[PDB]
Nucleic acid binder design. Structure first.
Lengths: 156, 135, 158, 131, 86, 192
RNA sequence: UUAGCUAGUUGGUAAGGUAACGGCUUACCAAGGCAACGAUGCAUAGCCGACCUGAGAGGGUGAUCGGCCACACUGGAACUG
RNA sequence: CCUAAUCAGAAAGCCACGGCUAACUACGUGCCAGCAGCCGCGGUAAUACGUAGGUGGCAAGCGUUAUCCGGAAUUAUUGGGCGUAAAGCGCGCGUAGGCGGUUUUUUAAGUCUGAUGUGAAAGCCCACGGCUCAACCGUGGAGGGUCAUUGGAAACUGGAAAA
RNA sequence: CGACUUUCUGGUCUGUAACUGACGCUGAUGUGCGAAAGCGUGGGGAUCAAACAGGAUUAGAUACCCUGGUAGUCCACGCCGUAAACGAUGAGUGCUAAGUGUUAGGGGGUUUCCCGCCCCUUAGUGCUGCAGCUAACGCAUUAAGCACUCCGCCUGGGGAGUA
């Protein structure tokens, strides 16, 4: 159960940072009628090379090869995610000043609240992104109090 | 069926749906108009890369990555092939292909011409694998 | 007539029993003259020579007449057996006999020049070549009915 | 409902073909009488006969089987069936098994065989295929 | 323009609920592309009865003379079979 | 592509005139070698006629298909078409010892169709038509030598050593162009 | 998993108006008129000739090219001829 | 486009080889890497990884992918079922409609059966002309209506009438 | 759809041919009828009975083994319209070896009622089986054999009868 997968989290968080010295921000498992899919978001550096995923997956799989208190075998999903992150905290927005983010704010336009812009600078609640919508350039201050949903976005 | 009911009916076929949702650029970059472009290729980036593990006995560790093409539509896609030099948020070309590794995915990257560079040590990449004739 | 064997393939049928799994090499041969005669046969064996022996022995027994004109059936019909039906029709010369592989071998063991044909229904070779032998056994000729009917050739005639 | 005369005529003919007997009779029509005469002309019906009684008279057929009670003909089927009023013009005349296979065709004057059809070149409602 | 047969259409009068105008329903039937069986279909024709003298069930031929009103196209040429309960 | 087989080694495989030839080539070719399939037989038919001729499919399958439009035969119609093909008739005229020999002659185009420069080996001969010999250089070594060695001149071919040209006469048949192999087989090959 | 549409609409009356035609639009009077044989609504679409595969049947397609139609930042016009 | 010369001399490859389908062995490799369209192979020994040879297929191109049909008859009019693999409401009444008994006439509506006008052109098929040829346009023919009209016809269906 | 009976009707067929003279046909839409449960309401509640609880069991115990009782089952109408309502065999048509019964008929002869027999069919419902056909299974005069007008479905599995 959840307690069990947490126990696996502590036991296998050792390797991750004695192997690739990564840290798992979490391990979560999804299942659809088969060995469930334990997505372990491995961190360390942000721009994780694919090799830095292959070798890390080798390490973690070998670690759990002899370690599986959970009776059945399961899919290890070794994830080395990028910077893309849901922006709940203000620091989440502060780190992302480099990269574009998209937010859903209490005042939408055209029915839906979700809009993507590319941050130029950090200004507390106010936003000076080069938000680009409909091929339109502008720095639009999106009030965070309006923001019902906010996530850091892909850079493309 | 009877001739009359045959007449007042089309006898419709069982026409399929393309299991490859290959909606290429079409009108994505104006008006965001959905357009069934059948392009064999769009340019686009894999914002994240990953690696799910296969089960035993063939522990053939397969690696995935989530990608956005010219239409920028989310999908987790596996990488085939040996050797690469790309990373997170690298531009990649993905071809349509469903393999025995994992469900939830029906496409595949191609090697040789973009950030996921192929290897020119073999001779099979003489006309393919993105790499030139091994000379 | 001069017996010319024609097998289709060799399937191994693992009649697994208590303990062992006895697989018999099963092969069906069709024996014909390719000039107006053909006959199929069946044989379950453990090897190619035994299978060909038995199936050719069975096949050379039962034969057919293959009534032809221009080395070709005077009419056109279709063969049907157990949904393994096939269709047949003559063809203009120099065009060749066209049909699916195994039944094409059947008809060359009947020895025809030009035929419109194509396999249908079942793709199982045994069933379709059986529909084929049924159809070929259901050939006739203009003289046959010119006798059978009081009327003769050249008035009601191909 | 006895929708079509051709259909029942031909299915009972095929039934007799299976059962291998010759003397059979059936309620006719004028067209049934004429086509039975055409049959005796073709021969495979050794003899036909018509009388009158309720409502159309019983046509009386007496087949010409083979030497060993075999079908001199091979196959037989209707063409013009309910709903399908199907017509053939001069060139639209078909040739089931060429001359060997035959088919009467009703034409602007009457019912004529395939030989007559391609002969006098008046098309019409193709009736039934026999071969 | 009588040499030109205009557009004559034998058909039945189905209604007259218009000032000096009736509607003739002249029946046809179109072939099937795959099949060949069909059923009778028609086109109602808003037609000018010069005094609404027509009656329901009036089998009648008509004549295309002029666009007379909305879809009012065909003059009557001759009342053929003006009928009542038979 | 056009013609790039050693041919004798290819004939080793095909057993067709143009030691080890009784066998296949390559590592185990002379050793015990594979059998043949009916589809493989048809493929061989294709080679034994075209690799015989020395032409490529873009020139060839079209010619195969143009046989099926006229009345009567098709296989024999393709037989005469190959005969009408350029190199086959001149080869039969003893002006070549293999189809590969005069193919250089005709692409080089020392042949002159009725005294007209046609330098495609893909040209089509016809009855009442004949060739010339580019009199400027009509008497080179190999050309006059092959003129000396002409085994025979079939009915459709009308040519003499002094005539310097053959003219087509009558639609040949496989009874006149040798190596009779099943034309029905080869038409079946391109059928499906 | 598109069933009611429907009021100049229906028809005529008089005017005007256009090449004509008529609600075509005005005023009149009257209530029509369409609606499962699928109007209506929605999506979508240029049209066809033509073309691709298919033995054909068929299916599919609609590049230039033939013509026909629609449009010319957007809407509302109108002068011109 | 053609002529004076230029040599074999510039100019060609690629795909595949377990089979399916044409072509295989040797080797290094080691169930691992992997290959991977399908069966699945690879565990050290692989003609299924890679390499060399050898072969095949093919070529001014080859291979991959995107799609349409053939296949796919996988619409089953041609060319499916519903006895069970998918299918009979749960079972009715019945409107329209679907088809229409025997015989006698008319009709010609159909139907058939020609004539007419009329099917842009091209493509379209055929033949043929040119372009070396091909490609190709061209030329004519053919084809091309389910169009309208009229000649017969009355078997048939549909009427009409008569039972 | 079975306790009995009646109500005031619906249907069943033998023979019948009585004779207008096709009046027939299945049947989109529509559309009635309709297991059970459930349920609205208004009663009953005799069981039965979920839930339930006492309560074994066991921290837990309804889990089941208890004890009782339990919405409702049951009466009035609706909602209910659904199911294994399944033969997943639409209907009607008429043809086609047999053997061989039935359920009602009739007839002929047979004999005392032949009721006793037989045989012919009437119209169904059997079992075996000609032919036929099905992958097989088997039907096979009551076809799943042969044909015909008219209805619906089915389109891999399942996703999901679910959204």
């Amino acid at each position: 159960m959840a307690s069990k997968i947490t126990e696996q989290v502590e036991v296998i968080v050792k390797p991750i940072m004695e192997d690739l010295n990564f840290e798992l921000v979490d391990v979560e498992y999804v299942k659809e009628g088969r060995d469930h899919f334990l997505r372990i978001s491995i961190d360390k550096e942000g721009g994780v090379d694919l090799n830095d995923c292959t070798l890390a997956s080798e390490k973690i799989s070998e670690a759990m090869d002899a370690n599986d208190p959970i009776p059945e075998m399961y899919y290890l999903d070794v994830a080395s995610p990028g910077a893309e992150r849901p922006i709940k905290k203000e620091q989440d927005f502060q780190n992302a000043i480099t990269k574009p983010v998209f937010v859903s704010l209490y005042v939408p336009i055209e029915g839906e609240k979700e809009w993507l812009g590319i941050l130029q600078e950090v200004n507390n609640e106010t936003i000076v992104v080069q938000v680009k919508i409909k091929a339109r350039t502008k720095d639009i201050e999106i009030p965070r109090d309006k923001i019902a949903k906010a996530r850091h976005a892909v850079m493309i | 069926p009877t001739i009359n009911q045959l007449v007042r009916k089309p006898r419709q076929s069982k026409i399929k749906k393309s299991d490859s949702p290959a909606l290429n650029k079409g009108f994505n970059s104006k008006k965001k108009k959905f357009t069934d472009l059948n392009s064999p290729q769009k340019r686009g980036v894999c914002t994240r890369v990953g690696t799910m593990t296969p089960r035993k006995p063939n522990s053939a560790l397969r690696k995935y990555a989530r990608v956005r093409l010219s239409n920028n539509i989310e999908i987790n896609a596996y990488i085939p092939g040996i050797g690469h030099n790309l990373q997170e948020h690298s531009v990649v070309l993905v071809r349509g292909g469903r393999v025995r590794d994992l469900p939830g995915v029906r496409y595949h990257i191609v090697r040789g011409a973009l950030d996921t560079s192929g290897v020119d040590g073999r001779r099979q990449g003489r006309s393919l694998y993105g790499t030139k004739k091994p000379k | 007539k001069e017996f010319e064997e024609r097998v289709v393939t060799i399937n191994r049928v693992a009649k697994v029993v208590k303990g062992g799994r006895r697989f018999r090499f099963t092969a069906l041969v069709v024996v014909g003259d390719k000039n107006g005669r053909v006959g199929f046969g069946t044989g379950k064996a453990q090897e190619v020579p035994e299978a060909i022996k038995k199936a050719v022995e069975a096949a050379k027994k039962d034969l057919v007449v293959v009534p032809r004109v221009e080395g070709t059936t005077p009419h056109t019909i279709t063969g049907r057996y157990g949904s393994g039906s096939v269709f047949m029709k003559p063809a203009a010369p120099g065009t060749g006999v066209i049909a699916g592989g195994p039944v094409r071998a059947v008809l060359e063991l009947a020895g025809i020049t030009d035929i419109l044909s194509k396999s249908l229904g079942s793709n199982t070779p045994i069933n379709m070549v059986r529909a084929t032998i049924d159809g070929l056994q259901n050939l006739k000729n203009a003289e046959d009915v010119a006798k059978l009917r009081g009327k003769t050739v050249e008035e009601l005639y191909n | 409902t006895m929708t079509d005369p051709i259909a029942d005529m031909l299915t009972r003919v095929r039934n007799a073909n299976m059962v291998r007997h010759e003397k059979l009779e059936l309620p006719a029509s004028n067209i049934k009488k004429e086509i039975a005469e055409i049959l005796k002309s073709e021969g495979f019906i050794k003899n036909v006969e018509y009388v009158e009684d309720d409502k159309q008279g019983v046509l009386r057929l007496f087949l010409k089987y083979g030497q060993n009670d075999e079908r001199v003909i091979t196959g037989l089927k209707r063409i013009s069936k309910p709903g399908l009023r199907v017509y053939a013009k001069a060139s639209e005349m078909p040739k089931v098994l060429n001359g060997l296979g035959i088919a009467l065709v009703s034409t602007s004057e009457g019912v004529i065989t395939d030989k007559e059809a391609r002969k006098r070149n008046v098309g019409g409602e193709i009736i039934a295929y026999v071969w | 323009s009588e040499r030109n047969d205009r557009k004559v259409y034998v058909g039945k009068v189905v209604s007259d609920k218009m000032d000096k105008t009736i509607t003739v329903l002249v029946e046809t039937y179109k072939t099937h592309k795959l099949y060949g069986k069909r059923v009778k279909y028609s086109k109602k024709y808003k037609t000018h009865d010069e005094n609404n003298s027509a009656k329901l069930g009036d089998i009648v031929k008509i004549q295309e003379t002029r666009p007379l009103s909305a879809t009012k196209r065909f003059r009557l040429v001759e009342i053929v079979e003006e009928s009542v309960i038979i | 592509a056009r013609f790039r087989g050693s041919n004798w080694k290819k004939s080793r495989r095909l057993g067709i005139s143009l030691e080890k030839r009784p066998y296949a080539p390559g590592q185990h070719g002379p050793n015990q070698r594979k059998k043949l399939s009916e589809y493989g037989l048809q493929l061989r038919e294709k080679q034994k006629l075209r690799y015989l001729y020395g032409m490529t499919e873009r020139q060839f399958r079209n010619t195969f298909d143009i046989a099926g439009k006229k009345f009567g035969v098709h296989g024999e119609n393709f037989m005469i078409l190959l005969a009408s093909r350029l190199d086959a008739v001149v080869y039969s005229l003893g002006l070549a010892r293999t189809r590969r020999q005069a193919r250089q002659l005709v692409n080089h185009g020392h042949i002159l169709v009725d005294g007209k420069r046609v330098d495609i080996p893909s040209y089509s001969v016809k009855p009442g038509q004949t060739i010339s010999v580019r009199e400027k250089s009509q008497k080179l070594n190999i050309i006059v030598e092959s003129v000396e060695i002409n085994n025979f001149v079939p009915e459709y071919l009308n040519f003499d050593a002094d005539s310097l040209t053959g003219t087509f006469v009558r639609l040949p048949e496989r009874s006149e162009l040798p190596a009779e192999i099943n034309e029905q087989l080869i038409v079946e090959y391109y059928s499906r």
